[PDB]
Amino acid sequence: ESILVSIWQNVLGIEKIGIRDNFYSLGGDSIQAIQVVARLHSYQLKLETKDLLNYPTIEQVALFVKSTTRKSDQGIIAGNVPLTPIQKWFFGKNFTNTGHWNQSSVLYRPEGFDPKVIQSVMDKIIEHHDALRMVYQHENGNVVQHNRGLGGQLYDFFSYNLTAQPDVQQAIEAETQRLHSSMNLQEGPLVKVALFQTLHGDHLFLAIHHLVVDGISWRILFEDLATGYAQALAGQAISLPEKTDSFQSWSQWLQEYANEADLLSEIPYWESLESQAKNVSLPKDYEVTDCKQKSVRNMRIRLHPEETEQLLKHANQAYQTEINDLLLAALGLAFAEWSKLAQIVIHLEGHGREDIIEQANVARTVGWFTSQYPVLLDLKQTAPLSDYIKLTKENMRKIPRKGIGYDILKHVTLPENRGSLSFRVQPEVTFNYLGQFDADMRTELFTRSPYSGGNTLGADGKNNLSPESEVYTALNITGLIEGGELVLTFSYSSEQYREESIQQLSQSYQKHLLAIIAHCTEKKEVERTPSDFSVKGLQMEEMDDIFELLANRL
Amino acid sequence: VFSKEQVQDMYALTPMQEGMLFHALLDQEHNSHLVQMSISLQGDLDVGLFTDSLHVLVERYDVFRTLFLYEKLKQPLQVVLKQRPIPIEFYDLSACDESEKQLRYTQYKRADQERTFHLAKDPLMRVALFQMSQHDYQVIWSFHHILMDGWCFSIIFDDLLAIYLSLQNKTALSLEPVQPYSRFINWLEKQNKQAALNYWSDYLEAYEQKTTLPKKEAAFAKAFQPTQYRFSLNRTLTKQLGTIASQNQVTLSTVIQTIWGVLLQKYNAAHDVLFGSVVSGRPTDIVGIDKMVGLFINTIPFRVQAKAGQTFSELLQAVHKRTLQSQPYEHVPLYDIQTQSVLKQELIDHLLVIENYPLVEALQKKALNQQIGFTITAVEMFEPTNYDLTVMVMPKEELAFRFDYNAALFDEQVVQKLAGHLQQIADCVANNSGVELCQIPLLTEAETSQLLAKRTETAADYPAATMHELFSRQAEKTPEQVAVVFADQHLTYRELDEKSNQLARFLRKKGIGTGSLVGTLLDRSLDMIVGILGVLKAGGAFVPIDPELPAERIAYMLTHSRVPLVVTQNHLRAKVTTPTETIDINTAVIGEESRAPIESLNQPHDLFYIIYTSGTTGQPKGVMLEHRNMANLMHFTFDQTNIAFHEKVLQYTTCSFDVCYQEIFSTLLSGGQLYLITNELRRHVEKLFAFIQEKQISILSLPVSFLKFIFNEQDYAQSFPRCVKHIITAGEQLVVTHELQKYLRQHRVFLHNHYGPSETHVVTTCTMDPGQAIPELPPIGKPISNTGIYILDEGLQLKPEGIVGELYISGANVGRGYLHQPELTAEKFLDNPYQPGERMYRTGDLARWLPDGQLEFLGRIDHQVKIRGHRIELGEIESRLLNHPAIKEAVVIDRADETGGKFLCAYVVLQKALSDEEMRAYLAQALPEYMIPSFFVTLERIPVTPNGKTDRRALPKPEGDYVAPTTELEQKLVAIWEQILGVSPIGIQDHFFTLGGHSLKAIQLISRIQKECQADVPLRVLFEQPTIQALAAYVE
Lengths: 554, 1036
Ligand SMILES: *P(=O)(O)OCC(C)(C)[C@@H](O)C(=O)NCCNC(=O)Cc1ccc(C2=C3CC[C@@H](OC(=O)NCCNC(=O)CCNC(=O)[C@H](O)C(C)(C)COP(*)(=O)O)CCC[C@H]3C(C)=NN2)cc1
Ligand SMILES: Nc1ncnc2c1ncn2[C@@H]1O[C@H](COP(=O)(O)OC(=O)[C@@H]2CCCN2)[C@@H](O)[C@H]1O
Prior knowledge:
Chain A is of the alpha+beta class and 554 residues long. In chain A, 36% of the residues lie in helices and 17% in strands.
């Protein structure tokens, strides 16, 4: 291209470069190529000198000049979408009424919402993201996902006025309980919408089937809906951020990656995990094989704002931890006191999206990306807390790709390709820590309905699973911050444990979390750990031997 | 005091940081791998703001705060300290006088070149400001290279001047974010190492013979004195090389590298030559690598290989393709690449560096971009270097060259001539892009005329009289003298002349003449000499036949020569199974022939002697000597040698190889007394020296193998003949054993070494040893009268002195050709391109002019041994073997294994017992491991071809290396080897690098030993004694 016809001239110093004069014949050179490549980089084009040198004519190297950024399809993608590991896990769990396994939230606005305006927004917002249109063919003895070209039946919409009933909260609760049931996964709108009018304003309901949504994806969706509604209220033509790699392309590269040599390199780690976890078992107050979500009860423990601000802003520095390392260490101590096992396995929900496929960009993708990986905690050497905290930090740092790999090996790798991994370990206990609630309050133009009911995003959602669904996890522990307080929620199956035993485990948790917050604030030195030093495979004995050798050499 | 808070990060070393860490740990006893800039600044400079800007510069770059820790760690680490100020010194010299200032300056600068850096304990940069005058400053700035490529100083000094301007003008730094070197460390760890090592093992696939340049001596000690030579090509030659490059579609760098390759080929007598190339191992894939400060420069093996018929253009394109293919893999450490070669440690031994953009001039112009109060007025660079030669090339308006060489190893004349050869190659290529590689000359007219004068300095005038005329004219000088003696009977010159006249009369009556070859099958009895001289006097050529040779050969010679007549004794007649007349030389009719002189009825140039050589054909080929070839010899031998009239000489050799009759003619044509050796005395050496004593024999003709072996046998030692005065030998590379050395002194016997192929003449060079000194492998000497020796390359181009090439012979000792099978003659004889009109003949031998003008032998071109990558003088091994009082007779041969791999075996005859390991140690006491044979064989007697040359056919095949048993006294001492090398449980005797260790693993080994054993074993000790046995001196 004429751009490169110029960029040669302004580097090599020879004029009138032709369409197929030779880089060397013009006097190019092993170095001047680096200059040409840097100059072309100012036009946002990438070219390897490995091609400039090898095809030394402009007409021939044009075949390799590339954009520095892709511009993924802003239009429409459709057709078969391979099940991701979390989706395959879901269909393998075989819930009673798989059409009732949802996420939702209820928005509010001080002056309400015009129904035609919000409907006009939900039209485009459900056009833009393609996965939200998908449907799940209950045929051929299996499941296969499909994505739908635009038409009718994108979303299901309901409208109500509750002002006739003083208990608006009960009326909206009982009515919203309906929609959660109504996911015609075979072919239907996997987004449910409702609007509830009231003297205090208009209440705006959104609900989405979990197979097509995620926490991060709910942030994305709320910021997209906030801009969409701002555009509609301003009366401008509605248009949205540039589409990132849309979920079909994600599933596709994921199944391509699901067999690559990179992921398979992890296999000996996950083997060491499963081979070490085999004999773990949390003891039960009552022995029963399955329970239903209606049996689940939840209870909460809280930290005061002072302890919360200490936990966030200061404890990290004593060991260069992140928040998850301290919460998990406290959980380890709690199970060491309460279960008296030598070990426990705790499952965590990573957000996925872990820069796995190098070319991929999913920063704007809407889908269920959650990656579930087990972690084994050592509970033996709890007495030197200064070193239990470090052991927990480095255990969390030994996970090879932040856990995205394990689900892919469990569900999506070619079954002959995946070695000895049994995948027999089951989530008796699972732990997650959400961020701030500002993933919901991410914009001021509307706010969460005070009548939120059981319809929250997280584990404190009440309507979002069918009461007849199985219990898939025995202890479900999720952290959040509200109003500057950390809350840990322990949700448990009654008829597997009794209330007093979860009160005990939760008080042991609060006690040890406070102990760790204090210990990490009173300690004045930053005792860095081997992961801090960018040397692969460094260990405590080697790190402290190196540091001793520095003292003997400075 | 230290605290953990002061460490910022750690990293593993990059490949080239590992290389320079190796250097700094090796050379410690006199280490310095230290760039020094001198930058002179004139104007107004605030030394305060220059100190502060240096400190900000050291804060800015983590590599200026890196310390390297290797002592007890599993692995060398970079440790980046958070803060580490460098030594900055300010000297106000402005009070001193100029002769004092410049002295104090230079004394500082020289001592600073000597002041080593401790890679751990001491900041790896130094700056000194000198204020020479009110507006004149010098900066000395020295740093270990391990920090950065020297050219990075352009970035570092642009940064420094930007900081200085920001300070003096109180303005924020605009400096772009530093590209972190951890990006390169991470990228190096992400790369697929094994694919690169596979590429490098493919690139070196066939690399047989190590490249060399003519070293002055073996590196008996690491004395070093950095010396330079520099020269440049004219403007026109530089621009024409640039045009060649622009038209063959290559860079001028590739032209320079191909010209260097062609030079190395000519110097090495090889078509495949490998040398080190220094490459900017900055991958274009890395974001921002073009401004990244760190150590990236890598040494990669650069390989130029010619096909036998390839043109220089076609080698240009080949080298271009190879360099393009190498670029993906040039970040591999050279210490790993070495393991992908059979040469291991010795793969690269000199560097060619092309400086397309130097640090000087660039630094000496950038500073004009700023309004600051000073201008860079002068600039200099210093850099130590390990290699014995480096070649720097600087493609300016004139292509400038510089050789940095250890003057302890290369003579100034060697480098001077190498520069002249580079000029000559460059000019040849520049004028004609398409010349054949074998057709480029190395030599200027000053070399050429000298080498051709080495011919004419042998010039002589000789009467060219026929060989039997020279005899006749001598025989009249002493007719009463006894010419030839047998067991009891003898002939005077008169009796010889008469009997030869009689036989010649018989032959001429029998139709003998100029066209005629006469067979002789005579039993080396008296009549044999009469047979020769009568046949020649009959004007025909004698064809000597061996009574002991196979009947198959006696038939082949007779049927291939078209001999009309054979002469034999009666009892040998039955050998002559051919349908040809067979005359008894005793025939009475010849006894009755007229005894007076017959006439010289032949021309000065006719044939007179056919002998058949062995060779590569199963058919022996009949080679024939013209009268001029032998006549030229005889006069030279009289004029300039130490044959004498009154001497007594055995005709010992088997009457059928070129020397044997040359003893006859030299003896006859000087009036001496010949004694005809009884063919049983040809084997019972116990009787030979006795007969020598009893007859007072004084000139002997002995094969080279005879000197290698027979005087070494301890039983024979005391029977050496005391009457001997000259022993003349030819045949093979001569080994004068130490016993033979001693048995020359005691009687001051003159030993003569004569080079000669048969087709030229019995000899064409001589060296004569009086006993002042006698090297074990003597030269072949000086060309005889009216001969040239031309050491050519395959294009008949003269090749420089001291360099191996084809040994061509010229002058009157060149025969007519091959008698039949004549079409082979045009392959072996031609016209002298440098003296047209004189005939030329090719020996298949390589030789070298010595600086003293003697000629030095390098064996056959067909049998270049080159085992384990290294060429190996079988003469050196045969010397060490034969010197052992246990060894009578050693022959060393390159065998081919049953896979086709060549390997060395020594066939050895033992006087007294020893065993394989004992002689292997005996060799290792004196000879490198590449030149110790892998197998040894014991025999009763080395077989010899009837001429005395050893028979490579008659030796038995080998049957069934470094291997040694398990022997560990303390596996606590070995488990470090076990864990580092990973190969196996280890034997104490095993050799570190042979077992696959390499330099960096030696660093790992030392740091382990100095932790687990608390001894600081120097990195040199693992090279002096690279085995676990070496520890004893540190624990006993
Ligand atoms: P064990 O058994 O493990 O064995 C491993 C060994 C061999 C022992 C290992 O430890 C080892 O010793 N390492 C290798 C051998 N040691 C060395 O000493 C290697 C070495 C030699 C010399 C230097 C320095 C040089 C040479 C660099 C000069 O050239 C130059 O301009 N810089 C680098 C080249 N690139 C440039 O900067 C610009 C020149 N053109 C180029 O771009 C490239 O050179 C091309 C691409 C090849 C040509 O371009 P285009 O035409 O194709 C400059 C400085 C001179 C010296 C100095 C002063 N310092 N270092 C470093 C290491
Ligand atoms: N002194 C010597 N040093 C080294 N090489 C020698 C020497 N003399 C000869 N050559 C070798 O002789 C070879 C050619 O002569 P050819 O072998 O046909 O004949 C013979 O050898 C006859 C047989 C009896 C004695 N001459 C040369 O290539 C060279 O290697």
